[PDB]
Each structure stands twice: as C-alpha cells, then as structure tokens.
Amino acid sequence: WQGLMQFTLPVRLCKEIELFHFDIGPFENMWPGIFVYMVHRSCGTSCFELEKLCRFIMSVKKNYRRVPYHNWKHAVTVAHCMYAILQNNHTLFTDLERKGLLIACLCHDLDHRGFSNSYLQKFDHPLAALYSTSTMEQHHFSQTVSILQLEGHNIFSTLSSSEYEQVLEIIRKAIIATDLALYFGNRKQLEEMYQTGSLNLNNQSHRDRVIGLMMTACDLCSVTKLWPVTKLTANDIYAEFWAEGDEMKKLGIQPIPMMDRDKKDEVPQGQLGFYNAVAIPCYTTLTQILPPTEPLLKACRDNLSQWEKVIRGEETATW
Ligand SMILES: Cc1cc(C)n2c(Br)c(CSc3nc4ccccc4[nH]3)nc2n1
Ligand SMILES: [Mg+2]
Numbered sequence: 208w209q210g211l212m213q214f215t216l217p218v219r220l221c222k223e224i225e226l227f228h229f230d231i232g233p234f235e236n237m238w239p240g241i242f243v244y245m246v247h248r249s250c251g252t253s254c255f256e257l258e259k260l261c262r263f264i265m266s267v268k269k270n271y272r273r274v275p276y277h278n279w280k281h282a283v284t285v286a287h288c289m290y291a292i293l294q295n296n297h298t299l300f301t302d303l304e305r306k307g308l309l310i311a312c313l314c315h316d317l318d319h320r321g322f323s324n325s326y327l328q329k330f331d332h333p334l335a336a337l338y339s340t341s342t343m344e345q346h347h348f349s350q351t352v353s354i355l356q357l358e359g360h361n362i363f364s365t366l367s368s369s370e371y372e373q374v375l376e377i378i379r380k381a382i383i384a385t386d387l388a389l390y391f392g393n394r395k396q397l398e399e400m401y402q403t404g405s406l407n408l409n410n411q412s413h414r415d416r417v418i419g420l421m422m423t424a425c426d427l428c429s430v431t432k433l434w435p436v437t438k439l440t441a442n443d444i445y446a447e448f449w450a451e452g453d454e455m456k457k458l459g460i461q462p463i464p465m466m467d468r469d470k471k472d473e474v475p476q477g478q479l480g481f482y483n484a485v486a487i488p489c490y491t492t493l494t495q496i497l498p499p500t501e502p503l504l505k506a507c508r509d510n511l512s513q514w515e516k517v518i519r520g521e522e523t524a525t526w
C-alpha cells in the first residue's frame with residue numbers, strides 16, 4: 208500500500224495508456240499504480256483519500272483468486288477499457304459516475320471461483336440459493352461492499368449519505384450488467400432506441416442501459432486487443448472453462464463443448480460464434496451511441512477476420 212502511494216507512471220506509458228488497444232500484460236508490477244493513475248487523471252487526485260484508495264486497491268487484489276482468467280489481470284484490464292471510454296466521453300458523465308464506474312470495473316469479478324452461474328445453479332451451490340439470477344455478479348457486488356466496510360477502506364467517506372447510496376446503486380447496476388445473460392436484452396433495447404432516434408442520455412433509464420453496455424464492452428475488451436494478445440487471453444479463458452468441465456465429469460455431469468478440453472478443435476468456430484452473437488453487436492451498438500469508441504469495434508472486426516483465417520487453416524506460430 209505504502210509503495211503504491213509513491214508510484215509514478217513511466218512517461219512512455221502516459222501516451223500508450225490513453226489508447227483502447229493498450230495491453231497491460233507486460234507491466235504486471237505496475238497494475239495497482241496504473242489504476243491509481245487512471246483514477247487520478249479521470250476522476251482527479253481529490254476523488255479519494257490516497258491512503259484509503261491504495262489500501263482499497265491492495266485488498267481488491269488480495270480478494271481475486273489465482274484462477275486462469277477471472278483474476279487481478281482481468282479486473283485491471285476491464286478498468287483500463289472503462290478509463291479509455293470515460294476519457295473519450297468525459298463530459299457525458301458525472302464525478303460520481305466516473306468514481307463509481309472505475310471502482311465497479313476493478314471489483315466486478317471479486318472473489319470469482321472460476322465457476323459459471325450455470326455450474327453454481329445446476330449443483331445448487333449456496334450462492335445460487337441466495338442469488339437466484341446473476342448469481343456470481345450479486346456475489347461480486349456483496350464482496351465490494353464487504354471491502355468498503357473494512358477499517359481504513361471506505362474510499363466513499365467524502366460523500367453525503369445520499370451520494371453514498373447513489374454511488375453504491377451505480378456500482379450495483381454496473382456489476383450486475385456484466386452478467387452476459389442481461390447483455391442480449393440490453394443491447395436489443397439500446398439498438399431500437401438508437402435506430403428510432405429516442406435514445407436520450409439525459410433519460411436516467413437510457414443512461415443506465417448505456418452504462419450497462421459500457422460494462423459489457425469493458426468486460427469483453429480482450430477481443431479488442433492486437434491479435435497475439437487476444438489469442439493469448441483466449442488460452443486463459445479456456446484453461447478456466449475446461450477446469451469447470453473437469454469438475455463436472457468428477458461429479459457425474461457431462462459439460463457443454465466449450466468447457467470440454469476433449470473438444471478443443473471446436474474453439475475457432477466457437478470464437479466465430481461468440482464474435483457474431485456477442486462481441487461485434489456489442490461494439491457496433493456502443494460505437495453508434497459513443498462514436499469515440501469506434502477503435503474497439505475496428506479492433507474487434509480485425510480479430511474476427513483472424514479467427515476466420517484460423518478456421519480456413521492460414522494462421523501463424525504459437526509460443
Ligand atoms: C473475452 C471472452 C469472453 C467470453 C465470455 N468468451 C467466451 Br463464452 C468465449 C468462448 S466461445 C466458444 N464457444 C465454443 C464452443 C465449443 C468449443 C469452444 C468454444 N468457445 N471466448 C470468450 N472470450
Ligand atoms: Mg463476471
């Protein structure tokens with residue numbers, strides 16, 4: 208925490224970090240510092256007490272598990288995408304939203320066990336008893352509130368009780384929105400609002416939907432990196448999915464192909480299906496609403512053409 212307070216971002220990165228395609232991968236020692244940097248530039252140096260923010264960040268890190276994908280790296284990656292959207296669309300948002308959203312993104316997968324909502328609900332895990340829908344996401348929000356209530360961690364203590372209640376609702380809605388089950392309906396409504404010219408960012412119901420799609424766009428942003436980085440991250444995603452598949456075999460339940468390591472051949476077509484059904488529509492709608500986010504769409508389209516290249520047998524060396 209102390210070290211973090213003395214972190215300065217190297218000047219070469221100060222330019223690169225503002226770009227959507229920025230990959231945090233090669234800077235692991237600087238991830239906590241990169242988050243403080245992004246909060247300071249977007250929100251401001253006075254949004255949070257520096258000691259409480261650093262204490263908060265280090266507890267958030269401790270409370271992500273050593274799972275192949277839903278880990279600390281993912282949290283900082285999703286926060287960086289949100290940083291880039293906010294910097295590109297700064298004055299469409301309030302200080303409270305900028306605060307809420309950077310924090311929501313860092314916390315949105317807190318205490319992830321590497322198990323899907325399907326697993327927990329099929330195996331009637333206690334979390335699924337509590338949280339009937341959006342099971343892990345309700346848990347991630349609960350974990351965020353637990354961390355905020357730690358001694359020295361309440362980064363929102365400069366707020367009124369009203370504003371505290373407001374920022375918790377921004378965060379609740381933002382984390383819940385990362386349930387991909389909710390994405391399909393959210394994007395369909397946004398697409399209709401946009402095509403019919405009814406979308407109004409000063410309409411709070413519209414604004415909540417736009418924020419939800421920003422949360423999907425940031426959660427999925429590995430598909431917006433340069434091909435080699437996207438391809439490396441896909442390996443982590445499958446490491447985790449296949450471990451769930453293995454855990455189901457043990458328990459006498461057979462898994463869906465995506466979670467079955469003995470169906471690895473179906474990955475390229477699986478990705479094609481994921482890009483067509485989820486990622487391309489997501490970034491397509493976000494770019495309509497927030498034209499500065501276009502680079503995410505262009506990058507997503509580039510990676511789709513790369514998966515097509517893999518499918519027709521034309522890819523290059525792996526390492
Ligand atoms: C960044 C990201 C996020 C999500 C949610 N991803 C998913 Br889901 C996938 C995998 S799509 C897929 N379908 C398959 C069918 C059979 C075998 C393998 C398959 N992979 N990638 C994601 N990336
Ligand atoms: Mg999640």
Ligand SMILES: [Zn+2]
Nearest residue numbers: 315316385426
């Ligand atoms: Zn996530």
